[PDB]
Every structure is written in structure tokens, then in C-alpha cells.
């Protein structure tokens, strides 16, 4: 259910032009990050390259990797725009389209994941794994690039999120800080959770194993979910049990 | 119960001079970070600017902003001094006044919050939100700048701390790593906790909603607090219940 | 049960030469990080120096400190090699010896701890504490340098790990994201856990106090362990109780 | 008399692959500068961006500008290849096609001039003048972007070269360190020299005013040329007079 | 004959605002370098700090020093404004007040000299000599900070300019690239030239010893001046002799 | 005739300890550049690595190259100390042993040349040529690494110095800014000057061809020397003729 990419971009530029006027200390930042770019794809590649840069691998090098991915699969940029909207609609602290793009590390991590996922599915595993782990240090989100994640995702606050190799996260999911989608121990093969559409996961929840969390479900903060959660229910506790409906 | 600013500074400088002599590898660091500065405010702005610097906004620009805030509200520097003492008095590993200022990302994150809170209350929201989110990536602490936080606060270890827009933290509070002061929903308006004076919050505790944690209470590690906690009580478990007295 | 250092290194170079051919965008990274170095110690000091570098302390300065430590206690490099193997044998996502060394922040943090532990035991506490806290910001692991940690350790994902001053972690232990090995409150002296050989600690587990976790035990994700756990037992829940055996 | 671009590039990659094997310390440099790039244009934009980067304008931003220029006028890349050959054929110290491209600041400055000249002729004077003056600090060559400069040029050693706004330098010219192509004083309009094809200019020669230096002439080191020099003549002295023929 | 500081600044800001609109690629640069600053002094300190920054001493540290000098002697900022006008009025390529301030290393070197001269006259010689020599590597101009230099000075192109300890340069002087105001020996005491008001010095001129160059004189490019030059005379050649009148 | 290396080092450290006390703004710089190092070799490698660092090749990488050269030929460090003394004795503006080491780009260029010369004579031509050209951009001195240069050399001011492949510079030579020791045109084989012991070369002199400048001779500023200069004479003019004795 996402608004048009080109429409979110225009909104973003309009907000930024206006914001640059009312805060002179950030005008340079708004121009470099948003206003000089012709499209959302180019602003995204610039941002990720600058934020992921290190002595190990410079921004100029990261950018050409991201630009190649976006040139080959421009739907990733459309997913970014859907992710921007997800935050704006769901987070009461965020009114502007430009806010997630500019500032939120969960959003940034989610878009870096898309690049890593594109690389991994092309067999460019080394580069995907390089990026995954540079994202873990820079944005404190560790998503394996083989995980299958949809669009309209919000990674709220985001610090300490861990998502495993064989996880699936469907559209419109909201995930808070310190959520693990992980295994049951020294396990192998299909071993990580399947999070269905519209699920919200509270802070510090651990969802472990190849188990379903059904569509529209709510996972309580600090839960340890070891069995499947039916659609449209609230699961909570250690271990998690059904405590209501959302 | 907080001693004078000029006095902690003199102590800090005394410690640094002596430390520079016994560790030649750190002498340059002690001089740049502390000894060439004429006051704590100057040392704080330098440190925050250096640690928050990135490709997207340099140390030289961040320092200007911090210096402006400290010039307009120098009580923020007095709060920093109380925060240094808090760590020295409560953390048994730390015995020197210079230690929180030099090394501890919780202390730095708390002082960065103060600048953001000053900016936010001046209507300079873009800059406060920029700082909040750079603090999140740099020190792994995500405090909304509209949160109202007192002095004599310890953020022990600090990684993964998240504090919401409408939270309150009174004086002399101690918070550990991975503590969330968050919402219950999908919530709007006044929706985050009220942590009263002298409260201690254990590692990984989630305190959710507009609920009081009474003064002198102890929140257990890994707790999920969903109802108010009376003063001078120990609350623990998922969900939290009264388990005793400090 | 460790493969010899020199064999690990030879395999590392073999993998990297082959990987550099199949991914041109990372060839420079592989040559700088691995292929130009004559031994594992050289590569580790270069990597740690580059990854911990900041405005307050440059790579060139950090490298000198790490090289000194490795010259005085070369067994730290053998511990690194055991740690590489640990990840390779236990993590189904990792097949190559080069992977932990190149990418995993848990591995990097563990090797940085070794340098800090060496400095701390030489009485060079300032420098040990500088490194501890730079590792906290860069890799999001906070290990006090006085903690005693063996070899064959895996810090899986690693973000939010906190280990206290008087903790002990024996050989072949596996620790996940957001694990605290901490105290029970306003405590002093021997106050942190003793983790025995082959223990596995799930995501977000808090182990509090000077309590033992016995040989080969398994701590559940999200547990709050307040009493000792007997060997070869699975403990879980808030608070943790015995739920089975691995 | 220029070898084709694609043949130059193929030779460049061949040399670099071989050189990377025989010097491990530079393998990373060769892969980043040359071997990861699909064509000479890509390598030139990367090199210019990295070498001109500063706090005021990063590599990532400079690269976009250079890539745009090269996309709109790919003949600039063919001029670069002619310039590489010029140095290789004329400089007895240089045997490899890769050498000018990798190391020589005169070559780099010449290619930066081309980008500036392209911007200047598009009316993008601010950006042309930014580049001119960044080239002056980085490579110590100050060429006004309105100067008209051909191909097969060698700027040997290059430091202190100054070329004025209305200068012309035809094909196959060789210029040494500290050469000024300048005016006669407080002047205006067409006021700088016209250097014709195959001219050789010695170290420290000043050529002043809108005067011609004819085809195949030789200007002596330390000369002050104030009148025109006929073709195929050697001019030298202060002021310069005819002393022979090359 | 030098117009007001507040007026040149207002012009500079007017130019920058307009220029930012017609070149989106430089808008960030215009905002960081000029538009976010409240006065010329602030813009100058920022620029000098950014351009002189290096591994050995960061922008944030250099800015403090420059700000202290400008606070103690704000006439240095008025001299900068006269120097901007000098270039605008004398260099036919330059028509905007913002151009010398933004781009011209001769202008920057001259303003860095003023800070060094202030430091030197305060007995802070180490810092003046540090700055002199960082200016030499960054802007390729080497002025001893004890040299006495007036205002309305143009250092045109500027590369390789060298001015000695006991030199004097009065108001309204124009100096080109590779000009040396040096000694004759193996000399001691008062040993460098006295350049009087309105003198013009051509490219590569060497003026050696404690000799006068009289007011309004013109020194020819490539000259070696060893005896005094009377006012309003043109001196040229090796060695220099009187050749006419301006 | 050089003082002992170990004696100059002690002097250097004594000066620096004292200077760090009287200038707090530079204490960090004195500690990082001099006071933390155990010997002159280690301070030199640190300095050259920091000053030559770029996006292209980091300080950490440059340092290991310089350390290897110094470990294999420690006489290079003794030549450095002789060079420090040369400046102190010959330059009236320099009293302290620490001054050349800290600040003078000519001294730095001379020591980088020694590293390049060591590499070139080991057949490591690529790395020697990398360094030569990084020195040309950073210190504005371009010395071919095959040139044979003695000790007790002063490169005064140094900007624009160019020395060719087959040049020789004997002990105790003084060379000023913009001196070229170059060829006669498109020449080959032994083609650059032979500068004998104790020669001083004035600013902007061009000495061209395989010609001798005899011991103790003085070359005038701005001369063009095309024929041999007998020992103990002063040569000057364009072209140079014998004008006296020193
Ligand atoms: C024991 C019940 C714990 C309940 O946790 C939540 O209801 C909860 C709170 C939130 O802020 C969420 O975002 C969430 O998904 C669940
Ligand atoms: C299940 C009983 C709760 C256990 O957690 C604590 O007692 C606790 C609380 C705190 O605020 C701490 O700082 C702590 O170290 C332990
Ligand atoms: C019984 C409630 C939670 C149990 O959690 C686990 O079984 C667990 C423990 C571990 O050490 C793991 O690595 C894991 O993935 C799950
Ligand atoms: C007759 C006085 C100086 C002559 O200088 C040269 O012959 C000269 C000219 C050039 O173009 C060169 O490249 C050179 O090396 C010498
Ligand atoms: C040999 C006659 C001297 C030639 O040099 C100049 O006339 C000259 C002097 C200057 O001060 C200039 O700025 C210039 O462009 C030419
Ligand atoms: C025409 C005579 C020119 C004389 O140039 C010099 O005497 C001279 C001056 C200096 O400062 C030097 O260092 C030098 O070697 C020569």
C-alpha cells in the first residue's frame, strides 16, 4: 500500500529546501545529503556509502557497489520509499518523509540489507558479508544477507537487532531494538523464524527456531518465543504464551 | 548532593597531569582531551565534537553547536560534573574523576543529550534529532531530546539504551545496558515512563507506558514493567511484580 | 583441540588469494587486510588498529601498542587462531578461516580484549581502559580488561555483550548478542560470574553475581540467572531454573 | 600520432597485474587504482576524486562531477591516453603506461584541467574555479580552466606551473616545473601566450603576454620570453633571444 | 583606500546565496564555508582550520588558535577584507568578493601569516613556526611569521613564494608565484628586503638582501635584484638594472 | 663532521619536554611526534607516515615500509641526524635540534628520499617511485630515488626542488627553493649534475646536464648553469659565468 516513489522524493526535497532555510547550521548537510541529488536512489547510495565508510573501505568504493545494485534492481529504491512511509505512519515522533532517510539507523540498515541481499542472490557472497558486518558496526543491526525481508518495514531504534540466514520477514512488519530472529542452538538448515505480514515485535523479544509468527500478531517486549504464534494474537512472557489479541 | 564544578575540574587536571607522566603512549591523548583546556565545558565540547564527527558532519561544525548551548545554559556543565561524580561514587571499577569524561560512552551520550535537549527546547528540532541519531550510532544510546533527564545520572555500559520522547528521569538514577523506557503500542501523547529519583534499573529491563517508577525503587535485570512500581520497592520478572525492598 | 597457528594462516592466505580473483571489488581489501602480511599477528594488529582508529587516537598509534603486546606474549595470536576455528566449527553460516578474521566484530572484540588484558596485567590500566571503551563504541562489546577469558571462544553477533571486571570465561564458551555477565546491584569485590568450559549462552541472557555456570551447561535466551547452574544442565526463564540437559 | 585508448588500457592492466605480484605492499594500491576498474575513464575519475578530496569537498562528491564530464565528452579520456603516451615516449625515466596514470602529478593536473575546461565551457564557472584551485594546492599546478590545451602534453615534474586564462597550448608540447604562461602586468583581454605544437619549455621559463611561440621551438630554462619566438628556433636568456635551432 | 568590513561581508553573503542556487553541486560548500557564518572572522577561522588540518593537528585545534588571535586583534579581519578587495580590483579573472576567500591559496596563506605574526609577536613562536610550515605544505607559500606585511596585498597564484624573517612588505603590494624575498649569504641580522607600498613583483623574481624596493616600482619576472630599486622605476634582468618607468 | 645520533636525540627530547610546558596547545603534538618515541628512527617513521598519508595509501602502511628500510640500513637515521645539524648550524632562523625534525618540509623530503633510495637500490622501484611522487605532492620536492645524495644536506624552504635520476649531491650541500638539477633536453644515460661537497645553490638556480659543480662553489640565485663550475668559485647569471669566489 505504498505511495509513489517520485511523490515521496518530491516531498523529501520540498521539506529539505524549507528546513535548510530555518536551520543554517544544517543547510550544508541538507544540500549534500538530499538537495544535490536528482533522485532517491542517488541520495540513498551517497548516504550509505558515507555512513559505512571506514579505513577498511572508502565511501567512493561503497558507492559504486550500491549504484550497481540499484541500476540492476531499481525496485529496491521503491522498497526504500515504502520503508520511509512505514516509519512516518507508525512512529508518532516522525512527521516528515525526510526524517527516516536522513537520521534513522534502522532505515539505513534496512536499505543496506537490500544491497547485501541483491549481492548474495548474485553469488557475490564476500561483498554481501562485508556489508552485513559493516552495517553491524555502523548501525548496530546484524541481518544476514540471505534473509528474505519485504517492504514497509520499520526497524524502530534498531540497536542490537539480529536476523538469521533463513529468516523471512513479510511486508509491513515493525521490529524494535534488541530483537533476535535466531536459532534454537547449534542447529542447521532452515532454522530461523518466519515473521508474517503486519507483525509487531517488542523490544528485546527473542524469536527462536523455524517457527511461524502469524499475520497481524503482536510479540511482547522481552518475550522468548519458542513455538508458533497464531495470526492476530498477542504472545508474551518467558517462554511466550498467548495473552490476548491486538 | 553534588560538589563544585571548579573543584572536579581541578581534580581532573591533577589526575591527567600525573597520568600523562606514567603512560607516555597516552600523553598526547591526555593533553588534547583535557590539559590544554581551560575549563570542563571546553573539554566537553571538544570531546563530543571529536567522537560524534563523521563524513556527514565534521568535528569543527559540531563543536560550534555544543559551545553555543554551553554559553547559553552553563548549568549543563554543572550537570556533567554531577554525572561524573555519580559514576565515581557508584561504579566500583571507577576511582578517578577523569575516567567518565575520558572513556565512558554512557557519560558522553548523556552530555550529548543535554545539548540536544537545549536545542529541542529552543525549537531547533532538526539539529536535536540529528544529534540524537548520531549519538545512537556513535555511543549506541538513543535518547529522544524531548525526554526530561536530571543530573547525577549513571548510564552504566550503556549499549542499547533507548529512552522515549515523553520520558522523565529524575536525579540520581542508575540505568544499565539495554534498558528501554518505551511505549506499549502504537501509542500517542504522554506514553513513556516516569523514573523518579534514586531508581536503579538493571540490564535489559523494559519499562513500558506512562507509568511511574517510584523513588528509590530497584528494577530487576530482564524485567518487563507494565504497571507502576511503588517507591523503595524491588520489581522484577516478566511481567514485573513486587519481590522485596532495597 | 586447536589446529596449529601456521596452518590456520596458510589456509587464510589461500582462501584470500582465491577470493581476490573471484571478487575484483574486494581485491584491495584482501591484499591490505591479509595478503601483504607475513603472519597472523601482523594482520591482527593492522586490523585492530584500523578498526579502532578515531580522531582521538589514530591507527598508527594503536598498532604500536598491539604489536608490543603480541611481541611480549605471542600466545595471544595462538588464542586468536583457536577463536577463528571456534566460529568456523560452531557457526553454520561460516565455512572459511578468513571470515572471522575479516568480518566478525565479536572475534575482533575478543582479540582487542586480549591486548587490554595483557596491558591491565602489566599495570598499564589507562591504556587497557582506553581500549576497552573504544572496543565498546566500535564493536559494541564491553569487556572489562581484568576479566579472565580463555580461547576457542565465540562471540556470535556480539552486540550489547557486557562482561564485568571479575568474570571468568573458560575455553570453548559460546556467547550471543546482548549477554551480560554482571553484578547483583551496588556490589564490590568478587562480584561477576564464573563461566566454565563449553558453556553456551543464549541471546539476551543476564548472568548476575559471583555464581558459577558449570561445565557444558546451556543458558536460555532471555534468562536471568541468579543462582549457580550445575554442569551439563539447561537453565532458562526469569529467574532461571533447570529445564533439562544438552 | 596516438595509440588507441583500449590498447593503452589493456597494457595498463597487464602491467598492474604483473606489478601487483612482484610488490605485495602495493597490491592493494594497484587493485584500488587500476585493476577493479572496467575502463580508463573509471580509473581516472576515481584517482582524481581521491587525490583532490579534502575536508571542504569529499572524494565521493568530486567523482560525480568528473564522471558527468567524461560521460558528456568521452574524448577527454582519449586525450588522457595521448598524454600517458607523451610521458612514456619523452621521459627516459618512464617505461610503463601505468606510471603517468599512477604517480605523476603533472599528468593528474592535466586531466583535472580537462574536467575544469569542460565545466567552464558549459558555463559552470564556480565548479571549474573550485577544481582549478584545488589542483593548485594538491598538485601545485595552476591552470586557468579557460586555457585551451591540446593532447599529447607532458607536464614534467610540474610544480609551480602557472597557465593564464587566455593561453593556448597545442598538441605535443612539453612543459617543465616552474613555467609561467602569463601576462606583462596590469593587463586585460587576450593577454597570455600561444604555445604551438611540439614546443619544449625548460624549467622556470616565464613566457609573458599575448605572444606566439612557434611550432617546434625550444625555450631555455630560466628564460623570460617577451617577444614572439619563430618556429623551430631555440630562444633563451633574460630577456630571451634566438640562440640556435633544435 | 579600503572599504568597510561589514560591507564586503554582506556582499560575500549575497554572492554566495545566489551562487548556491545556480550550482547545486557547490551549495553544501557555499553553506559550510560562508552562509552559516555570522561574520568574516568566523568564516576565515573555519576555512583556515579546514585547509590546514592534518593527521598531526586537526581542524578543531587549529580553529581555537585562529579564533583567539582574531578576538585579541580584530584588525586582522579588516586586513583580510582589504586583501580580498586587492585581488578583486587587480586580478582581471576575479570579479566577486567571495572568490579570494573561497579559492585562492595566496589569500589563505596571507591570512594564515597574520595569525602566525600575531602569535610570534606574543612570544608564541612554536605555534607560529608550526603554522608557517603547515602553510608551506598546504598552500606552498613560506612566509616567516616575523616578516612585517601590510594590507591590500595580492599573492597571485602564489606557489613557491618565500619571504624571510626580517622582510617588510608595505600596503598594496602585488607578488606573483615563485618570488623569493631572501638573503645573500650565509647572512645574519637584518638581511631580507624592504618592499615599499604599491610595488609589483613578477613571477620568479629573487630579491636578495637588506635592500629597498622603492614605492610604486615594478620588478620584472625572473629578475635577480641585488641592489636597491628607486621608487616608480622598473627593474629587470639577471642581475636587475633600471629599464624604465611604470 | 656530525654530532652523535644519540646525543641529538637526547637534545631533541629535552627541548620538546620544555616546549610542551610553555605551549599547552602544542603539548599533544610534541608528545605524539617526539616524546612517546624511544629513538629518532621511530619518530622519523611516524612523522613521514603521517605527513605522506593519503586516501591512496594510509599512514599505517607507509610506516611499515619506512621501519623496514631503517631496520635494514640504520645509517639512514645517522644521516637524518647530520641533516638536522646542517640546518641548525646554517639557518640563522633555527636554534633547536627539534625544529627541522618537527617542521621543515625540506628535511622531511630529504629523509623520505633516503627511504626511496634504499628501496630503489633493492630493486623495489614501484614503491620508491610511489614515495618520490607522494613526496612531490606533500612536500613539493621531487627527487628521483636513484639520485645519490649525501648527508649534512639542507633543503632550505625547498618548494619546487627537482633532482634528476643520475644526479649526485655530496655531503654538506645547501640547496634553496626552486632549484633544478636537471637535463639539457630530450637526453639519456648520465645526464644530470654532479654537485660536490659544501656547494650552496641559490633560489631558482637551474643546473643542467652531466656537469660538475666543484667543491665549495656558490651558485647564484636564478642562474642557469650549463658548463662546469670550478671548485671554490661563485657562478651566476643566465647563462652562468664566474663572478668571484665565496
Ligand atoms: C508481558 C506482556 C508484555 C507486553 O509487551 C507489549 O505489549 C509490547 C509493547 C510494545 O511497545 C510493543 O511495541 C510490542 O510489540 C509489545
Ligand atoms: C529476578 C530478580 C531481579 C534480578 O535483577 C536484579 O536484582 C538486579 C537489579 C539491578 O537494578 C541491578 O543493577 C542488578 O545488577 C541486578
Ligand atoms: C526455555 C526458554 C528459552 C530457551 O532458549 C534456548 O533454548 C536457547 C539457548 C541457547 O544457548 C541458544 O543459543 C539458543 O539459540 C536458544
Ligand atoms: C641558453 C641558456 C639556457 C638553455 O636551457 C636549455 O637549453 C634547456 C631547454 C629545455 O627546453 C630543456 O628541457 C632543458 O632541459 C634545457
Ligand atoms: C625583462 C623585462 C621584465 C619583464 O617582466 C615584467 O615586465 C613583468 C613584471 C611584473 O611585475 C609582472 O607582473 C609581469 O606580469 C611582467
Ligand atoms: C648575479 C649574482 C646573483 C648572486 O646570487 C647570490 O649571491 C646568492 C644568494 C643567496 O642567498 C644564496 O644562498 C646563494 O647561493 C647565492
Numbering used by the authors:
A (entry chain B), B (entry chain C), C (entry chain A), D (entry chain A), E (entry chain C), F (entry chain B): 2 to 247
Kindly provide excerpts from the paper associated with this entry:
Because of the poor water solubility of OGA, we could not crystalize StCysE in a complex with OGA. We did, however, successfully obtain a co-crystal of StCysE complexed with BGA and hence could determine its crystal structure. BGA binds to the hydrophobic pocket of StCysE where it is very close to the binding site of CoA. The hydroxyl group of BGA interacts with the main chain O atom of Gly-184 and the main chain O atom of Ile-220. The ketone group of BGA interacts with the side chain of Lys-219. The ester O atom of BGA interacts with the main chain N atom of Ala-222. The hydrophobic alkyl chain of BGA is surrounded by hydrophobic residues of the enzyme: Leu-209, Ala-222, Leu-227, and Ala-237. The binding site of acetyl-CoA overlaps with the BGA-binding site. Thus, binding of BGA to the enzyme may compete with binding of acetyl-CoA, which would result in inhibition of StCysE activity. It should be note that all these amino acids that make up the binding site of butyl gallate are conserved between StCysE and EcCysE.
Serine O-acetyltransferase (CysE) is an enzyme in many bacteria that catalyzes the first step in l-cysteine biosynthesis by transferring an acetyl group from acetyl coenzyme A (acetyl-CoA) to l-serine to form O-acetylserine. Lack of the CysE/CysK-dependent l-cysteine biosynthesis pathway in mammals suggests that those bacterial enzymes may become targets for antimicrobial agents. Here, we demonstrated that alkyl gallates such as octyl gallate (OGA) could act as potent CysE inhibitors in vitro and in bacteria.
